[PDB]
């Protein structure tokens, strides 16, 4: 699977819902077909790969041991409690496989809110003591590139890899290890309904006339003022995004958003 010419990528699935993988499958100009055939070499990815069981393991071992190195993209949080017993693949705890593989990677990218900060399963009471990558492997020097979102905008993944491939270094990161180029602004300052907010023109409810007129959704719970992402500018699927569909932002690209931003419909 690994050889010269095409950069190797090893994709790992920890505690997740696969929504992040599905997001990359939505790549547009270049599409997923271009990336897999012409730009990179996806050597391990449980969702699409042809091989399974022992042959799958073999393919991963082959790829991580390659004389050329590899880039690792991580999806999901790592279940720590009770010795990582809450998450096992091929009878190995996710904690082990990640401790064994991540320190060898030339670059590790945590893709999504779960991998980045812990996510949905780390929310109180956190029955599995799940943590993000940097948190569970700090003791091994693993310091990953973050890229938060649930799922993140795919343009943000592609842009980081392409920037890495041509520079052999990272772009510029914020306090949470996220690329300043994609997370250097609150979605609020890039929101079309901003004029409304600035003039106290809020909708009191969704069924109201003011919602129908597109008034600001702050009173209904918009987390946009304390969230960092590029949703309004890049949009999703080249066509829509949360508030344009009339629903407030739930701050999905922030650390402990599940507990920190809830109740979602209150401010």
């Amino acid at each position: 699977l690994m050889g010269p010419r095409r950069p190797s990528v090893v994709y790992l699935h920890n505690a997740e819902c696969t929504g992040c993988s599905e997001s990359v499958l939505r790549a547009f100009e270049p599409y997923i077909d271009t990336l897999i055939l012409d730009t990179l070499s996806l050597d391990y990815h449980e969702t699409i790969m042809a091989a399974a069981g022992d042959a799958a393991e073999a393919a991963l071992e082959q790829a991580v041991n390659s004389p050329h190195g590899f880039i690792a993209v991580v999806e999901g949080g790592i279940p720590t409690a009770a010795n990582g017993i809450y998450g096992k693949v091929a009878n190995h705890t996710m904690l082990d496989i990640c401790s064994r593989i991540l320190p060898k990677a030339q670059a590790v990218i945590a893709y999504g809110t779960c991998a980045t900060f812990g996510g949905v399963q780390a929310a109180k009471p956190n029955p599995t003591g799940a943590k993000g990558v940097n948190d569970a492997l700090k003791h091994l020097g693993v310091k990953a590139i973050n890229i938060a979102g649930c799922p993140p905008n795919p343009y943000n993944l592609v842009g980081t890899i392409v920037y890495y491939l041509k520079n052999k270094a990272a772009p510029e990161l914020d306090s949470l290890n996220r690329p300043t180029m994609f997370f250097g602004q609150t979605v609020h300052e890039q929101c079309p309904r901003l004029p409304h907010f600035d003039a106290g023109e809020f909708a009191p409810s969704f069924e109201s006339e003011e919602a129908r007129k597109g008034w600001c959704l702050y009173e209904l719970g918009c987390k946009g003022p304390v969230t960092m992402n590029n949703c309004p500018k890049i949009k999703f699927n080249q066509t829509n995004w949360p508030v344009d569909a009339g629903h407030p932002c739930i701050g999905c690209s922030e650390p402990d958003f599940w507990d920190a931003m809830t109740p979602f419909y209150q401010n």
Binding site: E16, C17, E22, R26, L42, G119
Partner: protein, 534 residues
């Protein structure tokens, strides 16, 4: 020659989630099986004490493959608990987005997750383009030229000669396998269509974002209705109509024809993967409170007796833990359910999975495309019956042939073609209603201090249901019972084997080092593990 002993496939790839399959083969046929889901997240524990309004945002993250389904089911659950009757436009927009999800979901399954168990991409290299384009144009109205197919062949060859096969690395077909039948021409046709469906699936997902906010994980639902006032405009309805037409064209011209070709080449697969009982929750309703007002109606069958279709009683579903890593062995109905983790190990105390075992009247039930199609067919549904007869016609097989890995695979395609045309009808009805003057999408409601509700969704994989027990205005107990729990879950306290473990029995295996046959049946169920355990 015949193999006897154990086989273990961990991880099972080309599925969602983390599954481990253990079988006991004797003389070339699987004699026993166990499906171990090996990841636990505990969404139900996390949900407690929280504002019921937020549930939908938490339960949607139960899965990203079947992205919209959980948020719909949670919203229908609370809607119900609250007693709101949402506007008809809200019902349309919700139904439309769901229809578009069945299409995207099913298209990606056949090509991107199931196909490689039947198709050999390397054989495509020695194919004659001119003769392949010929066979292509005679099974579909979409005409293919030799040049079209030649461009694909060149793309492949360059990729294979680089030594970097990436996703195809240790594929069970490399070097030839006694279980791959397709000749070169056909392998080239399917591969060309595997690559095309990669760019089409993006169109079909964009359809969801037109009204939904995005895909994966939409944001347009709320208690009482929907939030997208834009979905009323002619522009947005045109955009959606355009995308669905294109997506529909692919289903009728590429997907069904390919399916029939692959299925005829593998008609021997009409002998494995059969199950006994089925259940389906029906979908696409006119009345949110009446299950029988759905395009597809509810129903349950026992022992393949499709003449005596029984009604769905919601007080019959109860989940077990005897062979799961949970405290004790007490079966509980969702409204009095408990999620108490207690990990023994593989087979420790005879427990081997993080999935509970939902039983109906104490019986294991298959759910999903096969259940939704056979039930609807027996209930005399016009469209369903029309196309399944046509499909059985082309294949020259009787109805019996449907209880198999073959059938289950056909069924998913059949369901895709009928739902594809039904979206045209709901689109029309929705257009008319708008024209009549109804511009309402969200209804008022009040939060009860104490209440208990449920929401049913028949998703791409089957009967989905969320359950809430509100106490003092907060979430007192929230339980999810999903499609894969039904089919891929473990044995119950009476030791009745689950649907998948049962269908694996008898599966002939040619080469233990490359158990492609097991992957054919397991993938025909379209398993989703993050859904089944939450």
């Amino acid at each position: 020659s015949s193999y006897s002993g154990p086989i273990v496939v961990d991880p099972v790839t080309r599925i969602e989630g983390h599954l481990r399959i253990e079988v006991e083969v004797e003389n070339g046929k699987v004699k026993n099986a166990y499906s171990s889901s090996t990841l636990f997240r505990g969404l139900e524990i996390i949900l407690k004490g929280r504002d019921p309004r937020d549930a939908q945002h938490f339960t949607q993250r139960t899965c990203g493959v079947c992205t919209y389904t959980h948020a719909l089911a949670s919203t229908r659950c609370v809607d119900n608990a609250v007693g709101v009757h949402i506007p008809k436009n809200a019902t349309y927009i919700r139904n439309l987005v769901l229809g578009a999800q069945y299409l995207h979901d099913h298209i990606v399954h056949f090509y991107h997750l199931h196909a490689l168990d039947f198709v050999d991409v390397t054989a495509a290299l020695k194919a004659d383009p001119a003769k392949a384009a010929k066979v292509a144009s005679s099974i579909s109205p979409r005409k293919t030229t030799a040049a079209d197919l030649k461009a694909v062949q060149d793309k492949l060859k360059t990729f294979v000669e680089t030594g970097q096969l990436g996703p195809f690395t240790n594929a069970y077909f490399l070097g030839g396998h006694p279980a791959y039948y397709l000749d070169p021409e056909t392998n080239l046709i399917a591969t060309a269509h595997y690559l095309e469906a990669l760019r089409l699936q993006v169109k079909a997902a964009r359809a969801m974002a037109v009204f939904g906010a995005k895909n994966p994980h939409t944001q347009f639902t709320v208690v009482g209705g929907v939030t997208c006032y834009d979905a009323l405009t002619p522009q947005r309805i045109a955009e959606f109509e355009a995308l669905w037409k294109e997506t529909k064209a692919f289903v009728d011209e590429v997907y069904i024809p390919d399916l029939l070709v692959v299925a005829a080449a593998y008609k021997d697969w009409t002998q494995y993967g059969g199950t006994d009982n089925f259940i389906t929750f029906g979908e696409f309703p006119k009345d949110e409170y009446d299950l029988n007002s759905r395009f597809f109606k509810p129903g349950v069958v026992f022992k393949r007796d499709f003449k005596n279709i029984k009604p769905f009683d919601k007080m019959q579903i109860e989940e077990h833990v005897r062979h799961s890593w949970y405290e004790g062995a007490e079966a509980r109905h969702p409204w009095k359910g408990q999620t108490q983790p207690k990990y023994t190990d593989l087979h420790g105390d005879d427990r081997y999975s993080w999935m509970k075992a939902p039983r109906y009247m104490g019986e294991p039930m298959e759910t999903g495309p096969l259940a939704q199609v056979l039930i609807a067919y027996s209930q005399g549904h016009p469209k369903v019956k029309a196309v399944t007869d046509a499909v059985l016609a082309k294949l020259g097989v009787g109805p019996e042939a449907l209880f198999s890995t073959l059938g289950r695979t056909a069924a998913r395609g059949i369901e895709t073609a009928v739902i594809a045309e039904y979206v045209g009808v709901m689109l029309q009805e929705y257009k008319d209603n708008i024209a009549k003057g109804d511009n309402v999408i969200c209804a008022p409601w009040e939060m009860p201090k104490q209440a208990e509700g449920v929401g049913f969704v028949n998703a791409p994989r089957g009967g989905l249901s969320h359950w809430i027990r509100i106490e003092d205005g907060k979430i007192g107990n929230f339980q999810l019972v999903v499609p894969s729990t039904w089919t891929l879950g473990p044995r119950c306290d009476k030791n009745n084997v689950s649907p998948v473990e049962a269908s694996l029995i008898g599966t002939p295996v040619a080469d233990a080092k490359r158990p492609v046959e097991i992957l054919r049946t397991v993938h025909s169920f379209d398993p989703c593990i993050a859904c089944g355990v939450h």
